[PDB]
Amino acid sequence: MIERYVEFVGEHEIDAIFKYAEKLKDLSILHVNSTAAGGGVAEILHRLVPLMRELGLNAEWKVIRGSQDFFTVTKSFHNALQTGKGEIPDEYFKIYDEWQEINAGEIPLDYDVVFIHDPQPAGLVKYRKKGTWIWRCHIDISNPHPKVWGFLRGYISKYDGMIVSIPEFARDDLDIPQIAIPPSIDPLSPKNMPLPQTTVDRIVDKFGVDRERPIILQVSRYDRAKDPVGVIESFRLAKRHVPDAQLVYLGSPATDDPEGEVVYRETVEAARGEKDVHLLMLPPNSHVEVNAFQRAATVVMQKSIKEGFGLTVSEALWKRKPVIGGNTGGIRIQVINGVTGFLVDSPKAAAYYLVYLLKNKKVREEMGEAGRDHVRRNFLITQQLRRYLMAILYLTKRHA
Ligand SMILES: OC[C@@H]1O[C@H](O)[C@@H](O)[C@H](O)[C@@H]1O
Numbered sequence: 001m002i003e004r005y006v007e008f009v010g011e012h013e014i015d016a017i018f019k020y021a022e023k024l025k026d027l028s029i030l031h032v033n034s035t036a037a038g039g040g041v042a043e044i045l046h047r048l049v050p051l052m053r054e055l056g057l058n059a060e061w062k063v064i065r066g067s068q069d070f071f072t073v074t075k076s077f078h079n080a081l082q083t084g085k086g087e088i089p090d091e092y093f094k095i096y097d098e099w100q101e102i103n104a105g106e107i108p109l110d111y112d113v114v115f116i117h118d119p120q121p122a123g124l125v126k127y128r129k130k131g132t133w134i135w136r137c138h139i140d141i142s143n144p145h146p147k148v149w150g151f152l153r154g155y156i157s158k159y160d161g162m163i164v165s166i167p168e169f170a171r172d173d174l175d176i177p178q179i180a181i182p183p184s185i186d187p188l189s190p191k192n193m194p195l196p197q198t199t200v201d202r203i204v205d206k207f208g209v210d211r212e213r214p215i216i217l218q219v220s221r222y223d224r225a226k227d228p229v230g231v232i233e234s235f236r237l238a239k240r241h242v243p244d245a246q247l248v249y250l251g252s253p254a255t256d257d258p259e260g261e262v263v264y265r266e267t268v269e270a271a272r273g274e275k276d277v278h279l280l281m282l283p284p285n286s287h288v289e290v291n292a293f294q295r296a297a298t299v300v301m302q303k304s305i306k307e308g309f310g311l312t313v314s315e316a317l318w319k320r321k322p323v324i325g326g327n328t329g330g331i332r333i334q335v336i337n338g339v340t341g342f343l344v345d346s347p348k349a350a351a352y353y354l355v356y357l358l359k360n361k362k363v364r365e366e367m368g369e370a371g372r373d374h375v376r377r378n379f380l381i382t383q384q385l386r387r388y389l390m391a392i393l394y395l396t397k398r399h400a
Contacts, residue, residue: 001054001188005382008187013382020389021055027396031061032107032124033117034074035255038284039221040311041117041138044384047186051385060111064103064121069095071256074120077152080145081119082225082306088147100124113392120256122155132399134391135162138183139308140329141169161395165309165330177398179391182333184384185314185375190287192318195295203292209278213244214358217297217321219290219312222251222264222281224305227326229263230347231303232270232277234324237351239274242358246276250293252284294319298364299357303350307331314379317341317371322364324353334379340371 006014031049033041045061052059066074073092080086100123110129116122117136125133135156141149141164153173156162161177164170170178185192204211216235220226228249235247249267253260264279271277282289294300300316301324309330316323317334323341325331335341342353357364 002051002382004188005380008376008380009382013386017055017382017386017389020386020393021057023393024389024396025056027112027392028058028110029060029113029115029392030109030111031059031115031117032064032121033061034064034066034071034120036061036063037255039252039254042284043189043191043287043311044183044381045117047189047381048385048388051381062107064099064107064124066099066120068258070099071258075257075259077119077148078139079225080148081152082140082144084143084145086145086148088145093151097123100126113396116159119152122152125155125158128158132161132392132396133159134395135159137162137164137169137308140306141171142329160399161391163391166333168329169308177395179387179394181384181387181391182330182379183309183311184379184381185311185318186381187318191291192315193291195288195291199288200292200295203289204296207248207278207280207293209246209248209296211296213246214242214298215246215248215293215296216299216301216354217248217250217293217316218301218303219250219294219315220302220304221254221257222249222260222267223257224259224263225307227303227305227347228267228279229270230350231301232267232274233347234301234303234350234354235277236270236274237348238354238358239276241355245298245354245358246278247274248278248280248293248297250280250282250290252282252286254284290315294321297321299324299354301350301354302326302331303344303347304328304331310334313341314375317368317379318375320365320368320372322357322367322371324350324357334374336370336374340367340374 049059049061073095104127112131114133163181167180218231300321302310302313304326307329313334325335327343337343344350
């Protein structure tokens with residue numbers, strides 16, 4: 001598999017990966033996160049952990065378990081860290097700590113390297129043996145709720161190091177190494193692989209979307225952070241000027257996200273009257289269906305209020321789609337304003353750029369080529385893999 005990436009990134013990146021992998025042959029590595037079920041962290045680890053194994057690394061991946069209440073508490077911590085807002089009962093921290101204890105009993109932690117992904121398992125460091133512990137933060141912690149952050153920083157300060165997706169998430173109030181490594185797409189995964197036009201046509205038609213007219217696509221959960229209501233608004237404002245245009249909102253549920261409906265109803269409401277709005281809800285691991293819709297799209301949106309990175313952006317740029325992205329978090333390192341897409345602070349701004357891109361075919365096409373090249377140079381899985389191997393070599397040598 002790893003030799004297949006030379007086509008994209010060249011022989012020098014691949015040789016470096018082998019050289020780093022050689023130095024790490026005798027370390028065991030554990031990844032712990034909140035879901036294998038699909039999207040985001042699971043989607044990365046489903047490609048990344050097997051690549052680590054192909055390079056001869058003893059890499060394992062274990063998923064924590066919880067009650068509906070546990071995921072209620074962790075979803076509230078997530079929103080509180082990203083928005084700086086929310087009322088957090090004292091009971092939330094007790095539920096959290098109790099489910100750390102339960103998982104610690106059921107997950108062996110005797111590894112040379114332990115990667116803990118995101119806040120849900122951060123408390124497992126209480127039960128650490130003598131290996132190197134790395135907190136992999138996927139979310140925006142730039143301006144967090146002081147009580148939720150104060151609590152979490154209690155655990156984070158005990159790690160050997162920490163990975164954030166962009167430098168802007170690095171914390172002034174931590175002394176441990178903070179390394180900025182963005183997530184990545186696998187260009188050979190079912191999400192990103194080339195499809196024949198037949199496959200694209202099949203899937204777009206199946207869902208009752210007109211292939212012969214322009215499609216505006218957002219791939220995202222029905223989550224307030226992705227602002228589905230604001231996407232509909234953007235589309236409604238643009239639709240006056242581009243009457244042939246259709247909106248497809250392609251959502252899926254998340255194992256650690258119980259707050260996934262009512263927003264759907266609000267979205268349905270904001271959609272009422274417009275027949276060219278398609279609010280789709282697909283199973284997780286509908287990767288080829290997402291692929292098809294991204295290739296079918298004329299313009300892609302990721303109009304997030306908050307976003308750690310937004311893999312949906314690089315997925316669209318790779319397929320040569322311009323992206324209108326929320327001016328926030330890791331969207332800003334993928335969407336280079338006027339080059340790979342446009343950054344927006346409101347639905348009204350999004351509408352202006354929707355009409356611009358739909359009226360300017362050569363500009364759209366150029367932006368798409370610049371998007372793919374920007375992802376080829378920055379956001380492919382071999383770069384993330386190479387930088388992870390370097391972080392492990394760096395931090396294990398500091399630990400020992
Ligand atoms: O640790 C939280 C995780 O964050 C990712 O961005 C997201 O794709 C997953 O659905 C999950 O919520």
